[PDB]
Amino acid sequence: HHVLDKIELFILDMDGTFYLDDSLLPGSLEFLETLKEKNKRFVFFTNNSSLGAQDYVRKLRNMGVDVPDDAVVTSGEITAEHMLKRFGRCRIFLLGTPQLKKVFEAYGHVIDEENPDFVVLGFDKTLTYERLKKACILLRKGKFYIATHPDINCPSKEGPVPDAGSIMAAIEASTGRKPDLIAGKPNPLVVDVISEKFGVPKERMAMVGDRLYTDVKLGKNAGIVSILVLTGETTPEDLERAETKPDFVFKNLGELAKAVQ
Ligand SMILES: [Cl-]
Ligand SMILES: [Cl-]
Ligand code: NI
Known part of the structure; x- marks a missing residue:
């Protein structure tokens, strides 16, 4: 074997992976609960610079996800x-x-x-x-x-x-x-920064997201595992067409959570 057990830090997409519009996705909460139980960690990342990290922290909190200030990076x-x-x-x-x-x-x-x-x-x-x-x-x-x-x-x-x-x-x-x-995904700088900030080796990190091209490419560029979820931009039909596949595919964060419980 169970290769995903070694992941200590998960970088997560937001809209399309953790929630959709203003609603949490199936298993999202379950997933964080699991991380907490297993003493593992996560950080949200988005390329979307129309808002600051605190605006997204606020958005999450308003959906009933209580996260520290440093849980989001853009x-x-x-x-x-x-x-x-x-x-x-x-x-x-x-x-x-x-x-x-x-x-x-x-x-x-x-x-x-x-x-x-x-x-x-x-x-x-x-x-x-x-x-x-x-x-x-x-x-x-x-x-x-x-x-x-x-x-x-x-x-x-x-x-x-x-x-x-x-x-x-x-x-x-x-x-x-x-x-x-x-600066942003799929530039591996993002990963280097997060890795140095939380002191976790790349080999114990994963990118979890719904952006087939970008998130997979971030993983390739950075040398970390890519996990695609099927809740957002990416469908199974897109995966079949993709020139480069993700390391793992899961229906959603709830199924990923069960993989590591
Ligand atoms: Cl096995
Ligand atoms: Cl087994
Ligand atoms: Ni097994």
Whole structure:
């Protein structure tokens, strides 16, 4: 034998894996209960930088999942922390929501649209033309260019909606530049960070999610086990079509839980 017994830390997708819309999925609670009993650990991760980790902590709590503050990580905190680590406190032009802006400021970065050294692109649900224009002008001056994550679209109640990667396509068409760094899944940085933060070797970690391409690729890139659940973006028919398969497939977190009980 039982290979999954060795996993000490599970990185979990949120919407589509732990809950769907505003409702918890079958076995989600059971799964956390099991982890607690077995002295194992989890952390939620999302590429979705339109909100901060605390907004998602709040969302979970409001569904009756009591989690500590450090239970969620997003591409926003990964990006802000990586910049802080490698470059110190940075002057940035940010294409991001007010929530993402607080994330960068919490890491001691400063928004300076006049004299930035970085252009930083997130899931900017507050994008305007003028802001796109300014970003392009700066990119043409050769500013260092960072995106929180690559995703072209984001799943939604209304179907696939443009995400950071769609904005990237506009920027690239206008300036000819792609980001110098894209921090989020499937960049293995995410895993390295979490691994160092909680002191767990990659060999005792797994990625559990519903994003066939991204989550599997994160596992390959990072060298950790990928477990796909069937509750979200991925169907059995998608799995059959997939060029690269996950390490394990489970109906949902409740069935995964039974695998490790
Ligand atoms: Cl066996
Ligand atoms: Cl056996
Ligand atoms: Ni057996």
